[PDB]
């Protein structure tokens, strides 16, 4: 599903996701808006590494989710699976489960900083954009 700005912006407060683990509504939606273009069933093979972003927030699967084909990775407890998801889970049109990942993400160290995307993109920029005229 590609959704529409306000549409994802009110989902993903009903979500949670205004202001977990310190991170606004705003800079979620400007993850996803240069991510995926909102779209949900977005995936990129990374070549020189051999792992997968998958979904609307382009989540790899080195760590996060479990596709069976990514190499570089040795497997502590649910060290490469992290969120405890099939990555087909993150392609699915409903985003809870790509949210509750997202979510766990935030909880290592880096925080939002896991998205390269958001440093380049969002990072000490304006992003109430995003939410203007939404209703959040
Ligand atoms: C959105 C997304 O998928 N982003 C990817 C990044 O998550 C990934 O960075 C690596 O993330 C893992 C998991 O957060 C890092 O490992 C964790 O590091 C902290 C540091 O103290 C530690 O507390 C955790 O125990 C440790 N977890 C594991 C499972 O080892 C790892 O350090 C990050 N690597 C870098 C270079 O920052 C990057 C790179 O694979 O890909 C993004 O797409
Ligand atoms: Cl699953
Ligand atoms: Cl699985």
Redesign the pocket.
Known sequence: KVFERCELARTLKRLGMDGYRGISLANWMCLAKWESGYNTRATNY?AG?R?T?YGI????????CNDGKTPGAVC?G???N?CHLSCSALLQDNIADAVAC?KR?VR???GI????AWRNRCQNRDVRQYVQGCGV
Do not use: G, L
């Not at 927030?57 to 996060?64: D, V």
């Open positions: 990374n590494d792992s972003d927030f382009q989540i790899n699967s080195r760590y996060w502590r649910d060290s490469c992290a997202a993400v290592d160290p880096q900083r896991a998205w390269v």
